[PDB]
C-alpha cells in the first residue's frame, strides 16, 4: 500500500539502525592502572544474579493473586518470558549498548517488580479484568449445559458441519475441500451471526433479516440525546 521511500530513514551518525550506541561527544575511553589513582564507577558484575532473582520474584509475587488458577499461571509464565527474552531476540545489539545493556535491563525490570510487589502494575490489573470476563463467559456456558440447553458455540459448529456436507456432496468433479473454502463458509456465517447479535432473528427471515429495522427511527422518550442538542 505505502512504503517508506527515503533510503536514509534508518541512518544514524553511529551507523544503520543503531539504537544501541548512539554517537555522542563524551565517548567511552579506556583506563590504565599504572596511571589511575581513584575512580568512581557504579558498574559491577551482579546483573546476572539480579536477572535471576527478579524473575523468581515477579513470578512468585504475581501468583499470589491468581487463586490457584493453573491455566492462568501457565499463561502468565509465557507472558513473563516474553518480557525477559527481549534482550536475547531483539534486532538491537544488546551486547553493544553504551554502558552495559545488562545493568540497564535489570534495573528496568526492578522498577516493574516494585509495582508488582504492590499489585499495582498495569499488567496485573489487565490480567484480572481479562480473566474475569473469560470466566463469566465460561460459566455462562456451564450454566446452559447443566440445563441440557445448547450453547451458541455448539449451534454454530453443528450448522457448519452440515453445510460442509451440503457443499461437498456437489463437489464431485474435484475432491479437494481446501481450507480456503472451509473458511469463507464459516466467515459468511459469522458475518450473519455477528449482525444477529444487535438485531436478533425474529422469524424464518433469520438474523438481521428485516428491512423495517433500517427505516427512520427515533430515540425513545425515556432516553434522549444527553450529550447534545437534537434540533
Amino acid at each position: 500500500g505505502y512504503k517508506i521511500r527515503n533510503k536514509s530513514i534508518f541512518w544514524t551518525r553511529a551507523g544503520w539502525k543503531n539504537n544501541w550506541h548512539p554517537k555522542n561527544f563524551n565517548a567511552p575511553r579506556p583506563s590504565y592502572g599504572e596511571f589511575t589513582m581513584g575512580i568512581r564507577c557504579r558498574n559491577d558484575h551482579h546483573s546476572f544474579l539480579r536477572y535471576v532473582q527478579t524473575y523468581r520474584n515477579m513470578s512468585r509475587h504475581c501468583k499470589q493473586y491468581f487463586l490457584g488458577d493453573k491455566q492462568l499461571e501457565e499463561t502468565f509464565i509465557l507472558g513473563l518470558r516474553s518480557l525477559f527474552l527481549v534482550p536475547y531476540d531483539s534486532q538491537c545489539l544488546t551486547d553493544q549498548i553504551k554502558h552495559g545493556g545488562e545493568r540497564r535491563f535489570v534495573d528496568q525490570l526492578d522498577r516493574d517488580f516494585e509495582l508488582i510487589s504492590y499489585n499495582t502494575h498495569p499488567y496485573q490489573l489487565f490480567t484480572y479484568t481479562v480473566r474475569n470476563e473469560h470466566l463469566a463467559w465460561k460459566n455462562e456456558q456451564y450454566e446452559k449445559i447443566q440445563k441440557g440447553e445448547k450453547t451458541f458455540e455448539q449451534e454454530l459448529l453443528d450448522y457448519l458441519d452440515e453445510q460442509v456436507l451440503a457443499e461437498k456432496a456437489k463437489l464431485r468433479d474435484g475432491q479437494n475441500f481446501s481450507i480456503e473454502r472451509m473458511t469463507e463458509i464459516a466467515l459468511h456465517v459469522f458475518r450473519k451471526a455477528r449482525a444477529g447479535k444487535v438485531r436478533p432473528a425474529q422469524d424464518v427471515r433469520g438474523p438481521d433479516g428485516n428491512v423495517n429495522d433500517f427505516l427512520e427511527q427515533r430515540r425513545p422518550f425515556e432516553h434522549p440525546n444527553p450529550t447534545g442538542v437534537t434540533h
Binding site: 422518550f221 425515556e222 432516553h223 434522549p224 440525546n225 444527553p226 450529550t227 447534545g228 437534537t230
Partner: protein, 70 residues
C-alpha cells in the same frame, strides 16, 4: 441521570401526569405547550462544569504522580 433528577421526578409525578397524559396529546396551543414542557429525562442534560472538573482533575493528577515520583 443522577439522584437529584430522580428526586424531581417523585415530586413532579402528578405534574408529569397533567402535562404528559392530558396536555401533551391535546391539539392546539394547549398541546404545543404540553409537548414543549414535557417532563422526563433531560435532552442535553449533561453538566459541562462537572465534566470540566473531571478532565482537569485527571490531567493535573497525572502531573502530580510524575512530580512526586522522584
Amino acid at each position: 441521570m443522577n439522584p437529584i433528577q430522580k428526586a424531581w421526578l417523585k415530586i413532579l409525578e402528578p405534574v408529569s401526569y397533567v402535562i404528559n397524559e392530558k396536555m401533551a396529546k391535546r391539539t392546539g396551543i394547549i398541546g404545543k405547550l404540553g409537548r414543549f414542557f414535557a417532563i422526563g429525562p433531560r435532552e442535553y442534560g449533561v453538566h459541562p462544569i462537572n465534566r470540566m472538573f473531571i478532565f482537569m482533575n485527571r490531567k493535573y493528577m497525572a502531573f502530580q504522580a510524575v512530580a512526586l515520583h522522584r
